[PDB]
Curated annotation (Swiss-Prot):
Protein name (record): Neurogenic locus notch homolog protein 2
Entry superkingdom: Eukaryota
PTM annotation, UniProt: Synthesized in the endoplasmic reticulum as an inactive form which is proteolytically cleaved by a furin-like convertase in the trans-Golgi network before it reaches the plasma membrane to yield an active, ligand-accessible form. Cleavage results in a C-terminal fragment N(TM) and a N-terminal fragment N(EC). Following ligand binding, it is cleaved by TNF-alpha converting enzyme (TACE) to yield a membrane-associated intermediate fragment called notch extracellular truncation (NEXT). Hydroxylated by HIF1AN.
Cystine bridges: C1-C24, C6-C19, C15-C31, C42-C65, C48-C60, C56-C72, C79-C103, C85-C98, C94-C110, C186-C193
Annotated disorder: Alagille syndrome 2: A form of Alagille syndrome, an autosomal dominant multisystem disorder. It is clinically defined by hepatic bile duct paucity and cholestasis in association with cardiac, skeletal, and ophthalmologic manifestations. There are characteristic facial features and less frequent clinical involvement of the renal and vascular systems. Hajdu-Cheney syndrome: A rare, autosomal dominant skeletal disorder characterized by the association of facial anomalies, acro-osteolysis, general osteoporosis, insufficient ossification of the skull, and periodontal disease (premature loss of permanent teeth). Other features include cleft palate, congenital heart defects, polycystic kidneys, orthopedic problems and anomalies of the genitalia, intestines and eyes.
Sugar-modified residues: N41
Spans of repeat LNR: 1-41, 42-78, 79-120
Its biological purpose: Functions as a receptor for membrane-bound ligands Jagged-1 (JAG1), Jagged-2 (JAG2) and Delta-1 (DLL1) to regulate cell-fate determination. Upon ligand activation through the released notch intracellular domain (NICD) it forms a transcriptional activator complex with RBPJ/RBPSUH and activates genes of the enhancer of split locus. Affects the implementation of differentiation, proliferation and apoptotic programs. Involved in bone remodeling and homeostasis. In collaboration with RELA/p65 enhances NFATc1 promoter activity and positively regulates RANKL-induced osteoclast differentiation.
Summary of subunit composition and partner proteins: Heterodimer of a C-terminal fragment N(TM) and an N-terminal fragment N(EC) which are probably linked by disulfide bonds. Interacts with MAML1, MAML2 and MAML3 which act as transcriptional coactivators for NOTCH2. Interacts with RELA/p65. Interacts with HIF1AN. Interacts (via ANK repeats) with TCIM, the interaction inhibits the nuclear translocation of NOTCH2 N2ICD. Interacts with CUL1, RBX1, SKP1 and FBXW7 that are SCF(FBXW7) E3 ubiquitin-protein ligase complex components. Interacts with MINAR1; this interaction increases MINAR1 stability and function.
Similarity field: Belongs to the NOTCH family.
Negative regulatory region (NRR): region residues: 1-226
Gene source species: Homo sapiens
Length: 226
């Protein structure tokens, strides 16, 4: 890459930080959930991967540039009643104190009679949790990724109505899960909802690059076919 060390280490299933660079394709994707270039669609004159700096850079504040990692939001708020809200997230009861962007809009419990407003495409994620553990922890998994993406996610269902969670056999037992983004509330409160899953996948990869992911994700891909 930049080195012969990085050539050797690329795509070996381990993030090597000496190679965690745009030039080295984030260690052949080892550090970026296998995504070679999360900013491939970004037409900013800035190398936006260098501007994850806790400061607003407007040149990177577009969807294809990953909204500058949401660093152009001014009021960088967290969920005030995070403990209460986590336990009441997606529990089929509207908790008004949790009905805000920071709290993932109570997992859409307060928007139950509102039409779905799906982003185009499907997020395909491999996580190092076996299917049973993922299914049992699905609400927390969805809340965490939703919080990262500033929207609401759900596990996709197949045409039998079954949740699309499948065993994935690697060196560690994992799962492959298919997710959809529901913007039904996001669009009302936010100017930065993903209209398509491509940039959402890339933002997850970006968080992998930084090491700020809350769950042990292995890979993410945005699909239009599924
Ligand atoms: Ca590596
Ligand atoms: Ca920035
Ligand atoms: Ca609730
Ligand atoms: Zn936001």
């Amino acid at each position: 890459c930049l080195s012969q060390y990085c050539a050797d280490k690329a795509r070996d299933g381990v993030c090597d930080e000496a190679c965690n660079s745009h030039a080295c394709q984030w260690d052949g994707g080892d550090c970026s959930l296998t995504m070679e270039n999360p900013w491939a669609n970004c037409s900013s004159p800035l190398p936006c991967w260098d501007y994850i700096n806790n400061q607003c850079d407007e040149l990177c504040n577009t969807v294809e540039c990953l909204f500058d990692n949401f660093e152009c939001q001014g009021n960088s708020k967290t969920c005030k009643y995070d403990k209460y809200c986590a336990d009441h997230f997606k529990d089929n009861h509207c908790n008004q104190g949790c009905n805000s962007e920071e709290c993932g809009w109570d997992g859409l419990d307060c928007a139950a009679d509102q039409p779905e407003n799906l982003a185009e495409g499907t997020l395909v994620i491999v996580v190092l949790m076996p299917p049973e553990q993922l299914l049992q922890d699905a609400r927390s998994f969805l809340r965490a990724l939703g919080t990262l993406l500033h929207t609401n996610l759900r596990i996709k269902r197949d045409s039998q109505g079954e949740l699309m969670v499948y065993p994935y056999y690697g060196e560690v037992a994992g799962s492959k899960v298919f997710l959809e983004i529901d913007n039904r509330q996001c669009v009302q409160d936010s100017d930065h909802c993903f209209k398509n899953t491509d940039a959402a996948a890339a933002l997850l990869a970006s968080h992998a690059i930084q090491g700020t992911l809350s769950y042990p994700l292995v890979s993410v891909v945005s699909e239009s076919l599924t």
